[PDB]
Design a protein around this ligand. Structure first.
Ligand SMILES: *Cc1c(COP(=O)(O)O)cnc(C)c1O
Ligand SMILES: *Cc1c(COP(=O)(O)O)cnc(C)c1O
Ligand code: NA
Ligand code: NA
Lengths: 249, 391, 391, 249
């Protein structure tokens, strides 16, 4: 498919930025996670970035580390995440769905098999947190064979060489953590990540030239704060996402 | 783009977030530079000699092999400053940090030996040291925790995940991701992302170089085999390195068998794990069928690294090195045997290496063989553990 | 009738029951023989080198003396097998026992270090070892007690008298009185009846010989002073020996001042005791006005010998050596200072020597001086003790 | 004086051996010790060997070590022992009194002063447990100046040279732990010590050619065993000494 391409074209046709929220699949539970996700979408999320709980997320802060703890406490496994992914895609045919993975869960039962599974459930992209562009060959090749866009992070300490690689190897969107150079090398639309927790940062991202913004932990923080009340959790998630999406317009 | 090959066959690599690659390239570049710098070599040799106590002895153990045709020598890293081989490479890495104009050190530790080694090297070379240690390990290693603080290091408990070494490993990398400009991550074993497996081996290779020179001096020939325990792989690759091109010399790595391979309660990923990608490298790992990383179990807390250095997995693949395992009970017997017959208290880690040597001897007492066991560390720290088990 | 002079001026002698004199003459004769026997020398050199780890390092401590004109070196006996200098002479005495065709060893110990050293030497050289230890010390040194047993030694608690080192000293002699035919009493310090003060000095003199060679190599001249703690006197006389004829080299012995000389709670008999006759020798003693022997107090259990070697009392009398004292607090500060600035954990015993050196430096920071502190042992064993006191 | 000489001459004039019991002054108390001693004498002791409690009696077995513990527990000091010695001599003018000392209590306040004190209270001999003949010069010289007989132990592992010395240096009696050689060198009358705990050993000693026997710990054992009953202690001491003395006749 070309869900990202269709999304960005539609967003551009109305000078709008994309707002992409991140959540951990199965946090704090399978049932509640599915509801959280449906809420994020009803509230205006343009695409989703979903994490699959991993034992050692060496590339995540406390918010995410705790999110995995909650998920594992709920017995969430990669197999269950994929069952969830299938359900989510069956309810929402057009919203781009990107996974944030750790190399081992991808490599475990074979890289090709992982991306084949992604295509089967309808996933659109995959960002492997601990695979630099230097080690990405087998991953992006497998992704492309299965119509999965391989996503790469463009770090702050990046250089021109990394920029050329990321532009050449990525698809769907570039995970920005510069914008002119990326556009210059025809890189996938850039989404601003890291620190997106208020509407002004969304507007600032779009104004900077980015195609949108990703809220890497703010969503998870709202979940963390409303664990005691599932109903208040969804309500606050709706208000937050609604506010963040309006800022992209 | 790298200056050295990051892989040993299919194992190794640099599986870290993009933000950490510059730190690794910078580190690789500094190491290559340092290795060809005679002033760096002389300074490192000076610390090793006049501060750490190198060269270490090569002790012949006659009582233990009486009645057999086995001649056994123990490379005495237990006599190194700090009580273990860990000290060799932290001194080298500390010097590398300074060469890079770094003023702070980040280190990870399970049993605490590496934490203590990083702390003493940092104290000596004027480096601000912060150590990450799994809360579960902090609780069970109070002595080593106090030693670290006594030496001025800042000890930080890790409650995330299983609160053990692997969780300390992630937390260190996280910290380094955003501080590598002024801080150097002093990895504790011959594993992790390139250039660490290469760097640690090179900074531990004097173990084998000394052993070769000493054995030639005393026996006039090379060992039939050199044996070392394998937690992460540093003391073993340290001993093995200089002998790799000596095809007649067997290289035997000993992983902890714990309560027994068949019980699943062990720490032998190289021979009983499954290849995975974690801690910045592709290597054999202790993991679930699903791909989640598990802990390694052993009576010895120092053999807790849930994976193994990529160079060992490679040496095993091509058949240059052989890896076996030794259970808690076999290691306990070797520990008591050394204390009683040679008056040396070995670290429970080292005892695994010794136990396999004892097995080679006992199983074929009429086989003429010249063996060297790398006594990676002293076991004063294990006196309590062994105490409880006995009687 | 003796082959060597049993006295150092008015101090020393052989104040033992008549039944023990033959054992002492026999011992003296064996030692004199051994000293002129190149095979004995070569065998002793071999154990010292290949088993114990000699020569030990001479570490220059730059961080600690920064900003002053003091250059400080630490003779690293903490790196000796066993963690203290005790090992040097027990190996020599063990070889002497064998030379006399003895097969059993009797040893006394307070803090347990000597007990452990006697036990490891006995294990190595196939000697049956029995150690006497004051019940009070047995209770407070469980670690060292287990180490002894792990090494095959038989540990026997002493409840008589104050149940401390001195009481262990009497019990050993009692045993030896009726077993010296097949057993050798391995006295733990440079004290007791002749020939022990002489024997221990000679079997510890490599400390000073190595230090001289090392300092000449590194500085091109002798130290202005060498400093060592004095419990019984072995590590100190070991360091001093080779420098005695070097009149420009100051010899400084440091006795434990405990809570303070004026409090009477100390262990500094040489400078604050009174000459008496006990433990087979005439020497300064910790005793009541009535002549009863008292215990020496110190934060450091190793400096518990209630008297001092006769050669030190003599060196003091003629002014060749100077003796001072250091309190518990001064030693605790020196201990923490070394850990933090040089990454070396010194034994609380050694810390007294270091503390005096620190004082020499700090009191006159512009005085140019080249000092060597004998770091008699490592202080891993003191981690708990120091722990409690701090905060 | 010449109390030993007079004793041995009188014992010889009746082919009798001497029975010398040993006790620790002040064990288990000053009062009780004085009574014990008076009992030992009334029972037939020919001479006495008295120990002065010392902190580190490295030349004594458990029986004696415990005796010192009891004495110290009673607060017995060397000064008190000398007060006791004076009292004992004032009650018994002719019985030889020998002290078993440790070098430090003798050397403490000056060797000459110690022996001068011995003469003043009426002591006849002094055996310094940890002073071999090799180190005895100042001790025997001081003893002789103050009319105190210096006593030496003739060990089992002795040789001819030691025998000649002991014979030349000793006075009063030789503490035997051989008899022909001693007589040959004109040594002081020999008394058999060590292991004297039954009448037959006394008779065996006299029959061997010794002038008598010393009971080094048997007396102390009786004390130890009857600590609970002072009256039974004295009664048993009397029976034992009476039995031991009759065996010398
Ligand atoms: C840390 C340790 C080990 C295990 O680490 P490697 O990197 O496998 O050597 C082995 N022996 C001792 C004494 C240790 O301290
Ligand atoms: C036993 C000990 C001492 C005290 O003994 P000396 O005979 O006075 O040397 C000093 N340092 C260490 C480390 C000891 O173990
Ligand atoms: Na491992
Ligand atoms: Na002393």
């Amino acid at each position: 498919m070309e869900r990202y391409e269709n999304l960005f074209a539609q967003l551009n046709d109305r000078r709008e930025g994309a707002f992409v929220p991140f959540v951990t699949l199965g946090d704090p539970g399978i049932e509640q996670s599915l509801k959280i996700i449906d809420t994020l979408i009803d509230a205006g999320a343009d695409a989703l970035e979903l994490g699959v709980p991993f034992s050692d997320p060496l590339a995540d802060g406390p918010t995410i580390q705790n999110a995995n703890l909650r998920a594992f406490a709920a017995g969430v496994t990669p197999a269950q995440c994929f069952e969830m992914l299938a359900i989510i895609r069956e309810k929402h045919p057009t919203i781009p769905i990107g996974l944030l993975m750790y190399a081992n869960l991808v490599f475990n039962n074979g890289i090709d098999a992982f991306y084949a599974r992604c295509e089967q459930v309808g996933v659109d992209s995959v960002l492997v947190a601990d695979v630099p562009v230097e080690e990405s060959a087998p991953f992006r090749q497998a992704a492309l064979r299965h119509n999965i866009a391989p996503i790469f992070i463009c770090p702050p300490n990046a250089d021109d060489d990394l920029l050329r690689q990321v532009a050449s190897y990525g698809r769907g969107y570039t995970y920005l953590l510069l914008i002119e150079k990326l556009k210059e090398y025809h890189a996938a639309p850039a989404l601003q990540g890291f620190g997106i927790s208020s509407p002004e940062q969304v507007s600032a991202a779009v104004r900077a030239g980015a195609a949108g913004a990703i809220s890497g932990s703010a969503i998870v923080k709202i979940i963390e704060k409303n664990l005691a009340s599932p109903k208040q959790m969804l309500a606050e998630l709706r208000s937050f996402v609604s506010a963040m999406k309006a800022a992209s317009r | 783009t790298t200056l050295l090959n990051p892989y040993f066959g299919e194992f190794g690599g640099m599986y870290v977030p993009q933000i950490l690659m510059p730190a690794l390239n910078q580190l690789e570049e500094a190491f290559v530079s340092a290795q060809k710098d005679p002033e760096f070599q002389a300074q490192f040799a000076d610390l090793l000699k006049n501060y750490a106590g190198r060269p270490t002895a090569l002790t012949k153990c006659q009582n233990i092999t009486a009645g057999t045709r086995t001649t056994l020598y123990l490379k005495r890293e237990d006599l190194l400053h700090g009580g273990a081989h860990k000290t060799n490479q932290v001194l080298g890495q500390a010097l590398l940090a300074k060469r890079m104009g770094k003023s702070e050190i980040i280190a990870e530790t399970g049993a605490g030996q590496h934490g203590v080694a990083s702390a003493l090297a940092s104290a000596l070379l004027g480096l601000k040291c912060r150590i990450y240690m799994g809360a579960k390990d902090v609780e069970r290693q109070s002595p080593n925790v106090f030693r670290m603080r006594l030496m001025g290091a800042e000890v930080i408990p890790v409650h995330s995940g299983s609160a053990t070494l692997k969780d300390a490993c992630n937390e260190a990398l996280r910290d380094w991701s955003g501080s590598y400009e002024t801080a150097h991550y002093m990895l504790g074993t011959a594993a992790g992302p390139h250039p660490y497996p290469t760097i640690v081996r090179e900074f531990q290779r004097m173990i084998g170089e000394e052993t070769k020179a000493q054995i030639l001096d005393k026996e006039g020939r090379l060992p039939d085999a050199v044996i070392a325990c394998v937690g992460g792989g540093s003391n073993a690759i340290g001993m093995f390195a200089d002998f790799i091109n000596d095809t007649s010399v067997g290289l035997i790595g000993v992983e902890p068998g714990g309560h027994g391979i068949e019980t699943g309660e062990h720490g032998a990923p190289l021979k009983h794990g499954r290849v995975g990608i974690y801690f910045g490298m592709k290597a054999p790992m202790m993991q679930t069928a699903d791909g989640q990383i598990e802990e390694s179990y052993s009576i010895s807390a120092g053999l807790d690294f849930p994976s193994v250095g990529p160079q060992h997995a490679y040496l095993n693949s091509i058949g240059r090195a052989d890896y076996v395992s030794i259970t808690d009970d076999e290691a306990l017997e070797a520990f008591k045997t050394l204390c009683r017959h040679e008056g040396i208290i070995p670290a429970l880690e080292s005892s695994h290496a010794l136990a396999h040597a004892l097995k080679m001897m006992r199983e074929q007492p009429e086989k003429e063989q010249l063996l060297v066991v790398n006594l990676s560390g002293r076991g004063d720290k294990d006196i309590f553990t062994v105490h409880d088990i006995l009687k």
